[PDB]
Ligand binder design. Structure first.
Ligand SMILES: NC(=O)c1ccc[n+]([C@@H]2O[C@H](COP(=O)([O-])OP(=O)(O)OC[C@H]3O[C@@H](n4cnc5c(N)ncnc54)[C@H](OP(=O)(O)O)[C@@H]3O)[C@@H](O)[C@H]2O)c1
Ligand SMILES: NC(=O)c1ccc[n+]([C@@H]2O[C@H](COP(=O)([O-])OP(=O)(O)OC[C@H]3O[C@@H](n4cnc5c(N)ncnc54)[C@H](OP(=O)(O)O)[C@@H]3O)[C@@H](O)[C@H]2O)c1
Lengths: 495, 498
């Protein structure tokens, strides 16, 4: 295989590694992937094009893949098409070779071209990888298994992912684009400070250089806090490393930001959010769903410790649910009837959005200063604001205190669901969830867990499908809130 | 001067162009300037260091600059030292030549080196600039005038600034660094969007490639909203271009972020803040001090159309001052005595910081949901949070509605002052102000004004000095709050909408 190196693969691959089914693409057409491939395989570096505007890229197929592309526009526009086979003679306007070894040498010695791309057949992928002729793989990752009979071979441990696109979705699949690859001083000087700054002790996925997956926002914050956070002790309790002031954003029209670097407990997230929506302050309602994230905060021991000796177990006081639905009402206990008492911020914001989406006062505030002394924990996600433009709903949330290990992944998914529900009930499209972190911290007993997590390569985000028949926010149940195509690394226990 | 070009200058220059006084530097030691010069003139690119591990840069001095240097400090370590002189013939560890052109030609022919730098003095700087021999100037900008007898030449209009550092400060000056210069496809593909995208229509300071001055955060947001904001109707009747969700941050230990690309009305900012702190909602208090920023919001027409027909003119309702000092009290009018009524959020947060810097309640909230029906205009900077780490105070503020042209420059300065005050009264150093913008918009009648603004090169930020005797936040007066070394471009008229 002398002179046959530096071959570049383009391929789209289902979760079970299937690439073909009965000589056809196993999934419905993804126009975005057609365009991606077209763009990747037609690019000529300007300085090459400027000395001969004729120069073109080579695109190589196995026989069956050629016969699989519609017999109409088979010669792919603006590219040299090459097909390989030990049986077929010659193809209309396409170079035909017996084997790959000979194909590459003939093109590289005789035919003026820029770059060679390997575009399909498991047979052709196999030879290329098995011998080491590929330096680069552009791979479209699909988060769903499909029936098929043709598969992409395993990628040798000699490759690593160096690039991940943002996550995208169609009505039927979520997906992204990745690149696998084998294996200026003024910018430093003009910080005005130390030119030889020690490398941060922690870096998320240090092999990935083009980092466009939205999950890197969260992983980078994890690495930042471990690297630079100040230790905040607490007597009676677990210490944490802390750093202040971050902003993340998630495009909710593209995908649903359920973290993939660990298996996140979606069911608990949804049940907690439905409980907020109903205005509940009764921790038993969550326990009945075997959701235990609020349990420790409702216990006899914890309540007494905080002065609420007269308060029934799992009566959490005037927390989120109460503020969302009854801001300003006098809190009694979790059993009281608050109908028509206080301000229903959630109802009012939905009505306001419908009535005047340009209102600059679309806010729900859970920071009820007068009520703080009746909660054992002050609200954490304490203020959010909606915004409408081009008929798309966005949301910005202020998180006072951010448990990065356990809490923040819940908040990201929770507010994303809430934004989608509100958009649906108000007849709006989806914009962005913008997440402001104030005190962002990592508990010291989570250090090892998050060190493990930041090394893991994000999978494409899943996508959210709400039941389209739900007209009112109070009508959503867990069965109406469906996350599709969630692919995650294993769960990481955190106390 | 054949073969004598591409000489790089390092210099530190006062606001009046002074660089020397009685053959010494006119100002005392500037910490980051010393490191900048040392780092800038010793650096060898790793690849160049591969092909010659012993390679060094050259630094060149004229005779008077040479004599200003303690003989024991020469040669400057890790660099080839060249002195230009007809009167000194030999300097241990240094090369001596009679003039510049002889030096550069002999260096480039016979003395292997990486880059040549010119370190002064004025005579050499003038020879270099007059003869077109310099392609790059690393210049330290000091934001105040110094007495002196020695000057840096005017920089030819063939140069432009291509890089600006963050602002730094000592006890005596604020300063920054600038560079003047004479004049991959996968990254595009892997966005997953159009590979060929038209350039944004608006770009702040397009000649500046390294953009580390904190003011660029604000200028970039103006340019982003002008480029991509949606035209959006609002309460005022003057439409604005609007985009959602930004975060800026300012290191308050280094400088005070009073914008330099227009002259900002600092006196108005200070008077407004003192008014918040005293808990006042009486707009006449500000008008009596010739501060008119709240005027339109207090007028009869405004109050009536928001249904406050029984409200006295310039009674601004239960806004910031009231919420900061009296949260939950019953608002009557601007004349009532609210002493010991409602929750004094400002006093409590200061006490909490002193008692426990890690308190879970370090918030001042001006969004009193129960009070919304009593307000003609609800608080825009409606929520802020303090945070302590390493005995330094930081602040994060949520701004629901951001008039980018007129309002945001005030907010930036106002919260930075407030953070400095709280830090002083709690015995803390300074961290960062983090400013979160929700609906950020440019009124249509400010578009031309901000277009003018974003083409202006920022000056180093000034610095803030509070009267250290003040121990209680209520005791600050305007005379206690002093901004030093403020250099700005001219003011830019912008009309207020209400
Ligand atoms: N999702 C994707 O990214 C993607 C991309 C491309 C293709 N596909 C799918 O994959 C399937 C087709 O792939 P396939 O593996 O069945 O067939 P293939 O590799 O396209 O072609 C097989 C035939 O081509 C010839 N050939 C292939 N590799 C050769 C080599 N290395 N050396 C010499 N000859 C070689 C052989 O010739 P003879 O038998 O003629 O002697 C062989 O029978 C289709 O279902 C297609 O839709 C999917
Ligand atoms: N703020 C800053 O960054 C900075 C930087 C540099 C200097 N400075 C200050 O500026 C002052 C020194 O500058 P300066 O203008 O007074 O003097 P200078 O340029 O340092 O030195 C003047 C002397 O240098 C010699 N010289 C320079 N170019 C020559 C050439 N082409 N051929 C022959 N001789 C040449 C002459 O030598 P002979 O007369 O011996 O023949 C002349 O008397 C000091 O106060 C210093 O602290 C400040």
């Amino acid at each position: 295989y002398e002179g046959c190196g530096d071959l570049t693969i383009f391929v789209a691959v289902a979760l079970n590694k299937v690439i073909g089914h009965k000589n056809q693409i196993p999934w419905p057409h993804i126009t975005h992937d057609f365009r991606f491939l077209r763009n990747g395989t037609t690019y000529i570096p300007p300085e090459v094009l400027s000395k001969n505007p004729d120069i073109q890229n080579v695109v190589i197929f196995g026989r069956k893949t050629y016969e699989s592309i519609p017999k109409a526009s088979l010669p792919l526009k603006n590219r040299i098409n090459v097909i390989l086979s030990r049986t077929v003679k010659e193809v209309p306007g396409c170079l035909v070779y017996e084997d790959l070894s000979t194909a590459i040498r003939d093109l590289r010695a005789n035919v003026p071209h820029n770059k060679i791309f390997i575009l399909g057949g498991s047979f052709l992928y196999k030879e290329v990888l098995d011998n080491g002729l590929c330096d680069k793989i552009y791979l479209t990752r699909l988060n769903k298994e499909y029936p098929g009979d043709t598969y992409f071979p395993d990628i040798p441990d000699t490759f690593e992912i160096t690039a991940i696109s943002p996550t995208f979705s169609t009505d039927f699949v979520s997906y992204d684009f990745v690149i696998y690859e084998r294996k200026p001083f003024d910018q430093l000087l003009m910080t005005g400070t130390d030119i030889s700054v020690p490398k941060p002790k922690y870096v998320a996925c240090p092999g990935v250089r083009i980092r466009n997956h939205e999950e890197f926002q969260y992983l980078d914050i994890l690495a930042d806090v471990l690297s630079h956070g100040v230790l905040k002790p607490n007597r009676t309790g677990t210490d944490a490393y802390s750093k202040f002031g971050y902003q993340m954003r998630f495009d909710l029209s593209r995908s649903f930001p359920l973290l993939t670097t660990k298996k996140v407990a979606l069911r608990s997230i949804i049940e907690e959010l439905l409980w907020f929506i109903k205005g509940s302050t009764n921790g038993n309602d969550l326990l009945a769903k075997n959701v235990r994230i609020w349990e420790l905060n409702g216990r006899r021991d914890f309540l007494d410790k905080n002065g609420f000796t007269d308060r029934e177990e799992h009566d959490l006081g005037p927390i989120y649910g109460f503020q969302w639905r009854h801001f300003g009402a006098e809190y009694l206990d979790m059993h009281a009837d608050y109908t028509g008492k206080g301000i229903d911020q959630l109802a009012e914001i939905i009505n306001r959005i419908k009535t005047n989406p340009n209102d600059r006062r679309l806010i729900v505030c859970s920071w009820n200063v007068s009520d703080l002394k009746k909660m054992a924990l002050p609200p954490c996600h304490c203020f959010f604001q909606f915004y409408v433009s081009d008929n798309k709903l966005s949301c910005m949330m202020h998180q006072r205190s951010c448990d990065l290990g356990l809490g923040v992944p819940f908040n990201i998914a929770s507010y994303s669901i809430l934004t989608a529900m509100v958009a649906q009930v108000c007849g709006l499209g989806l914009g962005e969830f913008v997440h402001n972190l104030a005190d962002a911290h990592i508990y010291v007993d989570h250090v090892d867990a998050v060190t493990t997590q930041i090394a893991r390569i994000p999978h494409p985000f899943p996508r959210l499908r709400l039941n389209p028949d739900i007209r009112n926010i109070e009508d959503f149940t867990i069965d109406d809130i469906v996350v599709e195509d969630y692919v995650s690394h294993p769960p990481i226990p955190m106390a």
